[PDB]
A paper describes a structure:
The ω-transaminase from Vibrio fluvialis JS17 (Vfat) is an unique PLP-containing enzyme that catalyzes the reversible amino group transfer reaction from an amine to a keto acid. Vfat is an amine:pyruvate transaminase capable of the stereo-selective transamination of arylic chiral amines that is highly suitable for the production of chiral amines due to its strict enantio-selectivity and its broad specificity for chiral amine amino donors. All transaminases use pyridoxal 5ʹ-phosphate (PLP) as a cofactor for catalysis. The overall structure of apo Vfat shows the typical transaminase fold, which is comprised of two major domains, the small domain and the large domain.
In the present study, we report the crystal structure of the PLP free apo Vfat. Two molecules, subunit A and subunit B, were detected in the asymmetric unit. Interestingly, the two subunits did not contain any cofactor such as PMP or PLP based on the electron density map. As the dimeric form of the current structure might be coincidently formed during crystal packing, we confirmed the stoichiometry of the apo-state of Vfat in solution by multi-angle light scattering (MALS), which measures the absolute molecular mass of the target protein in solution. The theoretical molecular mass of Vfat, including the His-tag was 52.79 kDa, whereas the measured mass was 103.72 kDa (0.89% fitting error), indicating that the apo-state of Vfat also forms a dimer in solution. The structure of the two PLP/PMP bound Vfats differed from our apo Vfat structure in that both of the two cofactor-bound forms (PLP/PMP) of Vfat had structurally stable helices in the α1-α2 region and the α6-α7 region unlike the cofactor free Vfat form whose structure contained a disordered α1-α2 region in subunit A and a disordered α6-α7 in subunit B. The PLP/PMP bound Vfat had four symmetric molecules in the asymmetric unit. Interestingly, however, the two subunits in the apo form of Vfat showed different side chain orientation at K285 despite the backbone folding in the vicinity of the K285 in both subunits being structurally analogous to those of the PLP- and PMP-bound form. Specifically, the side chain group of K285 in subunit A showed a similar orientation to that of PMP-bound form, whereas the side chain group of K285 in subunit B had the opposite orientation. After careful analysis of the structure, and by lowering the contours of the Fo-Fc map, we discovered a small volume of electron density around the substrate pocket of subunit A. After several rounds of restrained refinement with Refmac5, we determined the electron density for the small molecule to be around the substrate pocket in subunit A. In addition, a small molecule in the apo state of Cv-ωTA was not found in the substrate pocket.
Author numbering:
A (entry chain A): 30 to 311, 313 to 454
B (entry chain B): 4 to 21, 26 to 150, 164 to 455
The structure:
């Protein structure tokens, strides 16, 4: 219904001039808001310079060159190699294929299975949707075979009766061990994880999880990929989600914040060990047949600028400084009887609605409580995403204290109204 | 690393090249040329990779792209009505397509669109009662680790590529060859079972396969067979779409009507990542009826394309269709072919093939037996590298080299292209002979 022609700062602006505080950041990507002049200028400058090209082995743009160097610098790696795609979905697909390729070139063509978790979200293509752990993909006959889903490390939802958080994590480690032993370590190509699950509902991992599963993965030579599509470039209060949760992956998948939402592109940052193994493999005396993944020079120039903005013009810092206030206000909202929990970190958070708090019982699906909240928020000039029984706050990093208050004021009005109505 | 080359080589996957390539870092272009950091100019006979059909400094398209950023849209995952841009592009696509009506779904690339169409078929067949109708009929083949990046989605069933020169039996006419492939298709449907087949995907002219136009009469022979069965026909126009074969679509050039079209890149003339799935009227209806029944709406399909991409696509479409670029293809194709004919008189050219502004030359060690050079000799690669040394970009594929230059190419630039390619072929073939 609402006609939108542009945005300003963190606001979507309709044709009548109504401003809607966008706590979805567009598509979880507009970290610097909708009309950032530096980013717009960088886009325009690159179109004037060199408006499209495709990267080949031995022939690429200067922008591909500079972005690759920047990305290694700000990665957790001392060295490595980067390639690009058009999206997070294709970056995930292409990393899978690169593992399949590498393992095949190393004499283990059976090493194909991909480990993810239930409630993971990795993309919409057939492979990345198979990696994804959502029930909605059953309508496509997905997942494809060889996409194995581990328990989601969401302690509040999956912890058994009287199971402590430490016990839950020990259980998830057993499960992983046993899945690896059952499948065979030689048949498993890699493990991919969002440090904080994004589209599955903003789900930080149980305490200690990555510390317990990483040694097991390493023991069995299963490559570790961090999917930083949502976490990446500051959303969790460090540059990467994997930093915030102290694990060193073998590669990083990036998109979204990469270009501050201003251009569709993905990137895969290969760490030193995968990089050396791929170099040596490429022994076969040729380039991988059919590998044609490429980004775009405009996307690369915009990404260079997005990185600079985020890291050198205060935006990642604003997330670190305002995260405590953000959580405080959430903690206060979670005192309500119909809020089961708040969860998140840095500038990504969710509130889960419940009909009964002690039992964690949701409202019946048919009441659309999440959606009701989300629609009421929009009536009140706030945009937030309903996911399952939750609503998500993922706002631009440029959010001011006043705008933060505005967000919560609106949201609290929405919650009062909606919870009162469903009570009637 | 200080130098551009060394920066490339140390931080980019694409810089790992160590018949060797050497590293070209490109900064800008002009018409069909690209220019590197050292000032070397190269005629880019691959149009980037197929998509840069208006070249590298087209002012109308640059201005249009810039203008989109100047006023960036309120582009959102779910809030607010579809942008005027996207609605208008969908109308335009339906209009220019072969269909009188249909629906459009958008992606960020030709690859994603392809994949989205597959998923669509899986959804639709499963909704209609046949969740085992999943196989895709395809002509794809490899040239173990060598079939990872190209390998279609699980359940693909392979048909023989209708490349007469390659696959024709000794003394088999082209006509008989097409009749044999029609038998293959019949046999393959009976063996797999029609009820297990989701669709048939075909690039009218096979692109990543080596630029292979189909044998005369192929589509006329296979389409009637596919129509006996409710196997949806998908025209993969990621390369052929918007003029490269001399018509707006590849399926117009080979005179057939698909159920849907996959489009990519060249939608925006390479200026912006986009793909589209254009469903014709039958599949639109079935898709609608499926959604309002099992009642989900399929996740990840979107009728809302990126608004910047959409405005750029509209401009690109108008440039190609109405500012003479598609016509220039049609006008210069005869001359393209005549020169290739001449080049194919060489003993180490087994054939030329192609159509419009997409062509390939295939190298052979012994022409009469169609014997290729030893794979280790990497002859295509050698040719391509030599082209680069001489200011020409062309693309090695298998034992072939491919030309797909921008549509703005003039006759003089075409002569330049061939002049440099002929000198490359002279040098490579002599050095191969000499060793």
């Amino acid at each position: 219904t609402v006609v939108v022609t542009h945005g300003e700062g963190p606001y979507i602006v309709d044709v009548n001039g109504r401003r809607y505080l966008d706590a979805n950041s567009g598509l979880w990507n507009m970290v610097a808001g909708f009309d950032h002049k530096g980013l717009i200028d960088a886009a325009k400058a690159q179109y004037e310079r060199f408006p499209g090209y495709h990267a080949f082995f031995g022939r690429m743009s200067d922008q591909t060159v500079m972005l690759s160097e920047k990305l290694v610098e700000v990665s957790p790696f001392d060295s490595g190699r980067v390639f690009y795609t058009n999206s997070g979905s294709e970056a995930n697909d292409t990393m899978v294929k690169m593992l399949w390729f590498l393992h095949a070139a190393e004499g283990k063509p059976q090493k194909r299975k991909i480990l993810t978790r239930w409630n993971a979200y990795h993309g919409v293509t057939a492979v990345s949707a198979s990696m994804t752990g959502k029930p909605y993909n059953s309508v496509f006959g997905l997942p494809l075979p060889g996409f194995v889903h581990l328990t989601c490390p969401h302690y509040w939802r999956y912890g058994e009766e009287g199971e402590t958080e430490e016990q839950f994590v020990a259980r998830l480690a057993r499960e992983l061990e046993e899945t690896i032993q059952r499948e065979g370590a030689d048949t498993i190509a890699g493990f991919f994880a969002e440090p904080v699950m994004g589209a599955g509902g903003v789900i930080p991992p149980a305490k200690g999880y990555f510390q317990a599963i990483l040694p097991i993965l390493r023991k069995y030579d299963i490559p570790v990929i961090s999917d930083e599509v949502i976490c990446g470039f500051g959303r969790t209060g460090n540059t990467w989600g994997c930093v915030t949760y102290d694990f060193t992956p073998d590669a990083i998948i990036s998109s979204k914040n990469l270009t501050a939402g201003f251009f569709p592109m993905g990137a895969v940052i290969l760490g030193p060990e995968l990089s050396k193994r791929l170099e040596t493999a490429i022994a076969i005396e040729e380039f991988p047949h059919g590998f044609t993944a490429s980004g775009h020079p405009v996307g690369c120039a915009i990404a260079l600028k997005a990185i600079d903005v985020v890291m050198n013009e205060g935006l990642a810092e604003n997330v670190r400084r305002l995260a405590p206030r953000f959580e405080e206000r959430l903690k206060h909202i979670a005192e309500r009887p119909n809020i089961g929990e708040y969860r998140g970190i840095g500038f990504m958070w969710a509130l889960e609605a419940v009909k009964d708090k002690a039992s964690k019982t949701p409202f019946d699906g048919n009441l659309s409580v999440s959606e009701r909240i989300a629609n009421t928020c929009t009536d009140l000039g706030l945009i937030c995403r309903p996911l399952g029984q939750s609503v998500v706050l993922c706002p631009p990093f440029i959010l001011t204290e006043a705008q933060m208050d505005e967000m919560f004021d609106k949201l609290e009005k929405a919650l009062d109204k909606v919870f009162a109505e469903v009570a009637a």
